[PDB]
Write a protein that binds this ligand. Structure first.
Ligand code: A1L0A
Lengths: 11, 258
């Protein structure tokens, strides 16, 4: 969903 | 404690461009100042794109995509920088999203100043230099985008900050307790108080001759907010009236009702 979340959740 | 050292080190680790590197180049790169030199830069720096028909679309649209990709890269660096600011990793994910969503463009336009002088700005990882006049010469609305950023940068650069100051300034921007829709305001406000406190102490020793630097910089944060407000209005005009200027999805997310 949110691209900002994926950035924050990445290794 | 060592909060300021940790923030400076996170800045040096996470941003490919900074002021010291930029000034080495700004004091050589390839100068883009018309259609012709823009084409030469593209042919050598992004050969795969020139052979895929990118030189068919307008100069404005090509520069648009250059800038867009730069912002996208910088948002990634800013996210990694934020994750290394003591305290940020413990916040709720939604609060983390809010802080970045409303903070990244104030930070980007703060850091953009480092790669600018009065005549133009570095691009393409420091290998290109696009002139202020050339940007001014494009067709509306594109010629309207960078000019107020140059104006901000000239005054911001007149303060003569270095990277250690800029790193704390950017951290203060990101950890902003008055972003709309924040949940844990009291704790983020406490994070900002610490960052702003060490910034004031850092400016006192790093710039002992400019005793008024700290409130000047506080006002610069308000100027950046306004700057981003005006810039978002340019983004709508592009969203509404430009056919070949597709907004990157990450940026569409950031700009959704901001
Ligand atoms: C208004 C549309 C929007 C794209 C959705 C945009 N259009 N244009 C633009 C287009 C044509 C031109 F002729 C001049 C500017 C931009 N320019 C930007 N700038 C400039 C490039 N860049 C940088 O150099 O940053 C280095 C720093 C981080 C160390 C990022 C910030 C940032 C953005 C941005 O809203 O994302 C942007």
């Amino acid at each position: 969903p949110s691209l900002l979340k994926k950035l924050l959740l990445a290794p | 404690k060592s909060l300021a050292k940790r923030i400076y080190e996170a800045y040096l680790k996470n941003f490919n461009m900074n002021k010291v590197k930029a000034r080495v180049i700004l004091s050589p790169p390839f100068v883009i100042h018309d259609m012709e030199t823009l084409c030469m830069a593209e042919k050598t720096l992004v050969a795969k794109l020139v052979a895929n028909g990118i030189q068919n679309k307008e100069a404005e649209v090509r520069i648009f995509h250059c800038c867009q990709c730069t912002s996208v890269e910088t948002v990634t660096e800013l996210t990694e920088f934020a994750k290394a600011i003591p305290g940020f990793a413990n916040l709720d994910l939604n609060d983390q999203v809010t802080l970045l969503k409303y903070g990244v463009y104030e930070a980007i336009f703060a850091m953009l100043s480092s790669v600018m002088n009065k005549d133009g700005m570095l691009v393409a990882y420091g290998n290109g230099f696009i002139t202020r006049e050339f940007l001014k010469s494009l067709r509306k609305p594109f010629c309207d985008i960078m000019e107020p950023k140059f104006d901000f940068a000239m005054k911001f650069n007149a303060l003569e900050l270095d990277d250690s100051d800029i790193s704390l300034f950017v951290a203060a921007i990101i950890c902003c307790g008055d972003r709309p829709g924040l949940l844990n305001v009291g704790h983020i406000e406490k994070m900002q108080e610490g960052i702003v406190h060490v910034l004031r102490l850092h400016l006192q020793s790093n710039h002992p001759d400019d005793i008024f630097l700290f409130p000047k910089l506080l006002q610069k944060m308000a100027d950046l907010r306004q700057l981003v407000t005006e810039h978002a209005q340019l983004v709508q005009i592009i969203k509404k009236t430009e056919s070949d200027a597709a907004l990157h999805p990450l940026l569409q997310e950031i700009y959704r009702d901001m």
